[PDB]
Amino acid sequence: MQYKLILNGKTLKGETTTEAVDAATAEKVFKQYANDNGVDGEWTYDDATKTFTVTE
Amino acid sequence: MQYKLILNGKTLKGETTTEAVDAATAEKVFKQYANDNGVDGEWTYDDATKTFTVTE
Amino acid sequence: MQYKLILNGKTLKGETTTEAVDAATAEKVFKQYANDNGVDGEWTYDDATKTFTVTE
Amino acid sequence: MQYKLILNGKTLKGETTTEAVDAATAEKVFKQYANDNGVDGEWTYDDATKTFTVTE
Amino acid sequence: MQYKLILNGKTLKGETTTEAVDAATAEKVFKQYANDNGVDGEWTYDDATKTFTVTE
Structure with a gap:
């Protein structure tokens, strides 16, 4: 499956993703x-x- | 200054950089x-x- | 990055902009x-x- | 050490400084x-x- | 198939290609x-x- 990481930092902002079996x-x-x-x-x-x- | 772009696509992966005054x-x-x-x-x-x- | 569209028509005139990775x-x-x-x-x-x- | 930036633009003029170890x-x-x-x-x-x- | 390598270094710039089955x-x-x-x-x-x- 795939998970999505959202960038919400001081100035880092956009989206991120990865393909993995586990969430951790x-x-x-x-x-x-x-x-x-x-x-x-x-x-x-x-x-x-x-x-x-x-x-x- | 220099900014660094990371390649994270379907198969395009490596690093990228450029020298600029502005980020935009x-x-x-x-x-x-x-x-x-x-x-x-x-x-x-x-x-x-x-x-x-x-x-x- | 941002692109700028100029309105030059019959009566519609002004400026326009959008934020995108690609021009197309x-x-x-x-x-x-x-x-x-x-x-x-x-x-x-x-x-x-x-x-x-x-x-x- | 400290570096000094001179403002020479269209209308923005003055002096600027910052304290850093490196120039970049x-x-x-x-x-x-x-x-x-x-x-x-x-x-x-x-x-x-x-x-x-x-x-x- | 064929892959293309772009030369972007300090002074070495041009194009490169090779014929292979695999990318690696x-x-x-x-x-x-x-x-x-x-x-x-x-x-x-x-x-x-x-x-x-x-x-x-």
């Missing part, structure tokens, strides 16, 4: 990716819509 | 370049680290 | 918008200044 | 700041006097 | 070739158009 494994990319992207804030995950969002 | 002028190259590259998706812009990323 | 996707709004606006003429697009113009 | 990091503020200020032109950087100047 | 096998030549050419940077691989590009 998908976050590994997005959370680690957030460091490479700069926006690191409070995280959340909706398993009902496979959608993640990070807000700082 | 830097995107003109990357967003226009994306058409020439094939990967056209949602966009975010890190002004916090000068990093862009496109996801389709 | 930006035209979809402007060209389709022109029908809703009434001014439909010869089109052109400058990718060097992200500027469109329709003349009838 | 100092420009991030000045070049990004220029968008917020309106004056965006050709850039230059003297590392011998830590002085930047933007001319449009 | 095609890169072996281009990546290894880049060492012989001097331009070694970040890499992307467009499989969507069969086009590679290296930026340093």
Whole structure:
């Protein structure tokens, strides 16, 4: 399945996605990716819509 | 300054960079370049680290 | 990035803009918008200044 | 150390400064700041006097 | 099929191509070739158009 990460940071904003079997494994990319992207804030995950969002 | 665009598309993946005064002028190259590259998706812009990323 | 459409028709004159990754996707709004606006003429697009113009 | 940016634009003129370790990091503020200020032109950087100047 | 590598380095610029069944096998030549050419940077691989590009 695929999950979608929304970029909501100081200036980082747009969308992000990944293909994974598990939600927690998908976050590994997005959370680690957030460091490479700069926006690191409070995280959340909706398993009902496979959608993640990070807000700082 | 320099901004970095990450390639995250169907199969287009690697890194990209450009030297510009403005972030919006830097995107003109990357967003226009994306058409020439094939990967056209949602966009975010890190002004916090000068990093862009496109996801389709 | 942003493109600018100039209105040059029979009586419809002004400026128009849109935020898009591609120039061609930006035209979809402007060209389709022109029908809703009434001014439909010869089109052109400058990718060097992200500027469109329709003349009838 | 500190770098100094000179404002030489259409109507925006004055002086600017910032405290940074690197020259390229100092420009991030000045070049990004220029968008917020309106004056965006050709850039230059003297590392011998830590002085930047933007001319449009 | 054939893939195309674009040269975008410090001073090395041009086009490159190779005939291969797989993309990863095609890169072996281009990546290894880049060492012989001097331009070694970040890499992307467009499989969507069969086009590679290296930026340093």
